[PDB]
């Protein structure tokens, strides 16, 4: 039920992400290596993976 979002801010294991314009927080307990440059997949407020240059 996940939608893709652009990470705009990171604060330890508590990144923040944007989805087509929505600001929502996202835990990073599954993706410790997330830089604001990365785009993540959010599932119930969590990060499961990071996208690729597909």
């Amino acid at each position: 039920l996940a939608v893709p979002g652009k990470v705009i801010e990171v604060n330890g294991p508590v990144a923040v992400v944007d989805f087509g314009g929505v600001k929502r927080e996202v835990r990073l307990d599954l993706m410790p290596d997330t830089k604001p440059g990365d785009w993540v997949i959010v599932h119930t407020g969590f990060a499961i993976e990071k996208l690729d240059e597909k």
Partner: protein
Amino acid sequence: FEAYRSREVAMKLVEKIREEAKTLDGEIRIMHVCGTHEDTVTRHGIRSLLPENVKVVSGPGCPVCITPVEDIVAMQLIMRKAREEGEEIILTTFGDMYKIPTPMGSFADLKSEGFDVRIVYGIFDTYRIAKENPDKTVVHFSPGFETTTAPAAGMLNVAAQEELENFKIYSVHRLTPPAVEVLLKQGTVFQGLIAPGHVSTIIGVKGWEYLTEKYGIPQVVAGFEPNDVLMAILMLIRMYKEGEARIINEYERAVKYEGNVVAQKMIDKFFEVVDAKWRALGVFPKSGLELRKEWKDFEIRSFYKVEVPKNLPDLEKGCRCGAVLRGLALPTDCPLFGKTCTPRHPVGPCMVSYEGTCQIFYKYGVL
């Protein structure tokens, strides 16, 4: 973005599919086991684009539907028991599970009885609630496949680290791959499997390879855009005709061949695989995830021993949700679908769960 939703792409794929299916020997039944996938197929009405000999059926891709009544009822018993012990427990559960029916009533009815039932959206919301009320024990009726078992097993780590004490969960997590196997073994037919995208994000392609090698059924880890499914349906039609039995990571943009090893390990830390009960489907071996003997403290069932009444029917008379979860029929093949059973007044879970095959068919008014 667009390229993954583009009508051009879709119409090229649809054409390609149409051509291949033309020289196909009979009827090909491709199956998917993720609710999100069913929603994708139905929302964009992909079925209204596929050849007459190409069929797409749904599998047990709903974590809520297959959650046993026995456990739901058991959780309500703990609620009353805990109260009979001066313990007013805080119950957190997903929006749809909150409404799931059982002969003993739903969690929503327990709410209309004074009990504190709060609809969360993520295991974290529950976590947020726990600290905000360290006086009362906050428990989360936790259902879900690999995709949702991760966040949970990830928050238990932040529970072990912080050594938090009022953070419990009722574990009714399930394993996708196994169910797919029990199905092949039990008669359900299909020549190809559209592996659930995000379930594959966690357990990676690796987690699926074993079904192909064992049963020779081609697979495709597909995404969720309309083109993703259309692309996957194409590959399966080919692999079937050419005689292959290999997995293809169509969703490679978001899937690592080995999946996320962090989550894997983390889950394997707090949960151990056990034989589980799938509502309306029966007992599937090694398909459940109950907390390991060690972290027996995070399982609300540790503190309260309860006696769930015997002879509690899984579904109400008439509900063919069991056949719908097995890919043996679509919700339109049900005498109650659209009549006595609708989201407003549902009969079986298949119509309650946000990812229920039936709720999705009604919601988008299948053609």
